[PDB]
Design a protein around this nucleic acid. Structure first.
Lengths: 262, 67, 66, 65, 67, 67, 65, 262, 65, 66, 67, 65, 66, 67, 262, 262
RNA sequence: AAAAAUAACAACAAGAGG
RNA sequence: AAAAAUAACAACAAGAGG
């Protein structure tokens, strides 16, 4: 009877993925909420009628330097409240969070610094992870449910990477990073929506632009749908489509038993 | 209202995103569309009226200053 | 009262289902039968009278125009 | 003044078991003895003097007017 | 105030011990000694001055009528 | 207006250490420097300014007598 | 009135005041201006604070009138 | 579509409450799992066909000397596993816990020392409260869903009692007891099933045998259905029937959106 | 072998409730209905066979012998 | 030995069994065949599971030893 | 013993991609090159000798039958 | 050849020993009996522990052979 | 054991650097030096003795043939 | 039988600070008192008794050689 | 590393102790908070610079009849607040409480009657102890941390004072006075600053004026620091120096790891 | 109250310290753990029953050339285990490690090469420091708490050395020697026992054998106790007595709040 | 972005935001 | 009362019960 579908694809710039055919693909998937991260465009560029899917409301948060971040959210129904930012500096200024607010649930798009640039990016990533855990500690006192659709750029465990014995020193599989993820999923009660149904290997999300990596499936799993503990039993079907790619990232399509309302 | 309304009029005129902290502590993002002596409309997705006796603070998100 | 009255009259005449959030945080929801300088009469199962000094926000379900 | 006097006078004379919800969210069931501006006398075993400025809603228990 | 002052003066002259409730739910006990437009003087081991813009209800302990 | 101001003046003369209880339960001890009908100053180590609409009660520590 | 000479003394000396609101929120900063209904607190971003939401105002250094 | 009903009535002796017509009432309520606490009978005494409902499997955990505890469970479907005892001394010896394990959920029955006898009963109650909070802290990490149908004999909130200003010294509304239920529901993430549906006063469970408290509704709310956080959104209809009671306690009928399996 | 068989047979005759711990830390809890050299079947609600090579400890819930 | 009568009764009656392994993983199917060392069960493909990894074998319908 | 040998001979002779799940839950997916009564040799890139006592299940990919 | 004299020497004078299993689980108590496959430990109830689950057996008082 | 002994013998006649995976997933590395019915002597900086009832797999680094 | 008995005898003669690794990763330093077909005595502050079926590896801290 | 110095001394008269060299020793400590108990001096008597310490702010609370008691508090940090009186009759008319409120912490000097000059002072001390227990039970629910530099004139338990076997019925080591402290340091959950860094006796803070108490150490231990349970970890150094003392009581010097700010 | 007594002393030869009175002073301390660093003697030399003390147990680890190092360990409590050597080259044959394993806690006496008698000892010291950091990173996954009584021969910050400006290039306060400890106490995050009771310098643990160094206090601080996270609050008393000293180093005594159990 | 609502904490020197 | 399954922690002196 009731069903909901959330797609949280990362686009690596919305114009390049729109040239590679994102919007005509997203129009034909019947998603309730589409959660785009790393938009790389200001909000004055997304009210262009090329980015506008029909039957969808597009809400967008920009960065202060528009190539640095950017985040968008397509919604079937008009939400109760669309808010932006988290409060701390490495999220609010650089456009890495946007929260749509519905009847009982709320759906939040989330972007992170990748950490794969240098050591300054890794320090910014670690302070983002700590301040975001400080935010998530305060969220357990409220009753509005949350769905954080986030390109976290961090793998969780050894099944989420290929050949983990040669990945322990690259950013994305570090020991404080995996400590952060199993502190969020483990002790804070939050749930990975892709692992609540499909407990299988060889489900990857990110690939480097080397074609030999793409040919032999040398992948990573970076984007997640993090769920508040009340929503772990509603996950019907979570899947990462391997083939129809539009960036370095693959989409994440999760089908819930929830009935989304205003 | 000698000083109360060059401020809200400046927030209306430049479409500055404001956060209205109520006396509950509920914070409401939006942008000021109209205001009389008593109420203030904010427009996030659905436009709504907010009574000023329930408003604690009205902050802007980027620094604007008075005429 | 340059803007108090026509918004509530547009919610009243169009019979828009409206939602009043109180200063406690309580979400009342119904329809506006009538109002004055101090109260809103709210139509539901039974007609409440809500004082305006407890109303924090008045939120329509469909948007209205002056 | 206006609409609240006709409203409360009906709840007096048809003797209706009202419920007054305060600003801090506390319901007081009972009847209305009498009122004027910023008082309501709430009728119970002990008659209360409830200030109107501390009242959020007046909710009848039977549909009236 | 056409029915506030007879009620408070009847509560004062008969000296009924009251339970005066505040707007944040705090019960105070004692007896009424003086009421102005704005204040009510509760009396106990000391003499307070409560404000009428913080009082929710005034509850006597024994039932009295109105002259 | 006839009864608030003599009470506060009597608490000002004898410099009795008083406690102002605010509407959310906060007590503030000190002495009363001066006041108007919207404002009451308070003498602790710092000298602060209290608004009367946020005041619930004003209690003394010594029993005081009105003229 | 001592309210507006007190606020003028806080502004002209530029004292880093702390405004405590009626629900417990503490807000530091300096004062830009004030009206009958509003104070303005200046910081990283300048804000208006409605006067019916303020419990107390506390200066940092002990100033005189 | 799917539905589930759980009744958690306290009987104060199954032989004394079966004379007042409990079983002919429970047969006509269409309950999936019936959760009886304070049975005051051995497991050999529930073996006769007088307590046997038809279409219900009856599993019971007795006390050693039988008049102190005793706990029973009627189940529509035969559960996967019926286990007894928590693991410490003030539960396993006196028969105050029984657990029926099903497909994804597991429905448990919980009895407590009332604490209203004297000071030894209050010390035993505080020992049970701390050891059961340790049990919940251990069971927070497990992937089952629990439904603890418990006569806790502790009111949580001021709305859960009538005239609380003279109940702060009676056991049932103490400050360590309300701090315990503020710890279980507040910070441990557990949810009260009666408070998810109804958020209104004058819903009471226990009444002392003085009739003056009875006809004027001077009551208490003692038995709860404590829920793991995954089940806080399935709770449709929770209600305490006032009139058709069969002991000092009223039954607690909670209807869930869950579909109970084997 | 010659010490396991009288122990399990004494647990079978008296119907003592046992807790069979497995080698992966799972505590099964039932009654030993019968056994052989290699498998022990227990009954809680459904009878199940349990291979002895996956059993660590057989704990009775009350003393014996 | 009650190895062979219990496994033959789960086989010939064609009862859906659930088989819990030593690492905790359950395998639900029907016992197609069994040897002294292996158990071949069929859900989609024929699956050979060694008995040194079997922890428990539960049925869905209770069986009686012949 | 008397039933696993023709099953593994079938899995070799038809050359089906098997997946062997060990007793610690690790999938080794490949194709059976040979087997003794103590070992299995599989490959996808380099020929492994997986011990038989460390194997829980041997799951083929397409359904094959026992002759 | 070396096991059963050690277990006898350790079980006669009733040394409180700790049996460490292959999970890491330690079990304090004295050994009452043993055979080719089973040990039997006593702390609060005479449980039976299989030897293919036992990693080590460590006695408390340092005893000789 | 009629087909594991030629494999473990030709892993040391050519001295292939093997990676031996234990039953708890621990990857040991080295060169096989000798093998009994029960043990395998893994040669490295020091020559340790690995029991065959704790080994899951024995993989070579370069592919060989029997 | 062809290697483990001379290897553990070589570790018994010279007092080599041996380290036994169990199948769950537990690392036990010590010295080998004696052994048999099934069990190994370990020498430390206390004397341990470790069965062979739980032993993963037996590594020495000083490099030894077999005759 | 933080370092906050609080010296609590029961001077038995500030004029009687200043002639022994009180101010000259207290000026050369750089102490943050000075807690003077039992000053026997009025507020106007402390106004002259003979009792003043230069650079230290002084706040003092006297008695009505100034020969009975009164406390004083020095701090060079001007506090957020300072309050006098506990909130009942037999504490405000004696000057037996003075609490200086800084941010995140409060430091309160506390005086108790001796109770050794007849049964009337013992009954008044019992009244003070009972409603002080009521005051602490009220102050438990607040958030901010408290420090009570208190001369309780009561020992806790058996191994506290020397030759306790004849001290069973003398006032100061009675049975309800020990019941008071074992329920305060029991259910009410407070702690001491001297116990966390010194878990033994043989260190006292009260000697009668006699040469046998000077040499053979007939000592009692009275000057305590009662802590809320969110401050017991930061206790670093506690010092009761014997000969350097200008009164019957033994000066107490404590050093915490707290940063005392405005 | 727990009281565990651990002394870390660096003797520069146990006979050269015993001729000054090491054994007679240590026998009258009743210490639970004695860590003798740089014993400069073989194990058969410690088989002399003069070094056998009042019920202490001896465990010692020597070098090949025994004057190059060697550590020793005295304990009343017979431990669960005692282990020697970390597992690499420059620690096993030098006798530079000995860890005693009790229940829930372990102590470990540790010795480092000085690095001041040739640059080959400096490169040896850098090798030891690097694979010691690798060892600590391997040990971070374990549960049980470790105590490292060690002479690191390195200072940590600017507040640690005397005569600051020319100590930049001497071996002992170098730049990568400092960086080693600032990632150990930084990103890795261990703790120091000498800091947790004294956050101020002007206290050293090594003096060069010259008159100006022992008169005008030209000292360096070497004997440390490195603590894992988990043992950071239990330290109470760390004393470095100056004049009573049997080597160029200073003897260290510490008392922890721990129940040392077998 | 807010508990269709705690017959009511003789009272949180005050949650940069219930 | 048990993750239809971590191409695999050179290794947790050991979770009276993972």
């Amino acid at each position: 009877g009731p069903a909901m579908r959330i797609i949280s694809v990362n686009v690596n710039g919305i114009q390049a993925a729109a040239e590679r055919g994102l919007l005509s693909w997203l129009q034909a998937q019947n998603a309730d909420v589409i959660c785009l991260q790393d938009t790389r465009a200001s909000a004055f560029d997304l009210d262009d009628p090329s980015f506008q899917l029909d039957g969808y409301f597009l809400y967008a948060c920009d960065a202060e330097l528009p190539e640095q971040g950017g985040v968008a959210l397509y919604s079937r129904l008009q939400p109760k409240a669309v808010i932006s930012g988290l409060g701390f500096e490495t999220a609010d200024r650089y456009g890495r969070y946007l929260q749509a607010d519905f009847d009982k649930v709320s759906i939040a798009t989330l972007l992170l610094p990748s950490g794969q640039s240098g050591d300054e990016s890794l320090n910014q990533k670690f302070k983002f992870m700590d301040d975001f855990t400080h935010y998530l500690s305060k969220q357990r006192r409220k009753r509005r449910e949350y769905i954080y659709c986030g390109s976290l750029y961090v793998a969780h465990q050894k099944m989420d990477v290929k050949n983990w014995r040669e990945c322990q020193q690259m950013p994305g599989f570090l020991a404080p990073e995996r400590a952060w993820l199993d502190e969020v999923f483990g002790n804070l009660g939050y749930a990975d929506a892709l692992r609540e149904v499909s407990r299988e290997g060889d489900q990857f999300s990110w690939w480097p632009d080397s074609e030999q990596a793409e040919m032999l499936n040398l992948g990573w799993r970076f984007d997640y749908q993090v769920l508040t503990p009340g929503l772990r039993r509603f996950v019907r079907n979570a899947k990462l489509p391997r083939q129809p790619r539009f960036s370095q990232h693959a989409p994440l399509i999760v089908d819930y038993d929830w009935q989304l309302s205003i | 209202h000698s000083l109360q309304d060059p401020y809200l009029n400046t927030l209306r005129k430049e479409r500055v995103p404001v956060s209205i902290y109520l006396v509950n502590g509920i914070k409401l993002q939006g942008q000021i569309e109209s205001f009389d002596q008593f109420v203030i409309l904010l427009k996030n997705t659905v436009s709504q009226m907010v009574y000023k006796h329930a408003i604690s603070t009205v902050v802007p998100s980027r620094p604007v200053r008075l005429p």
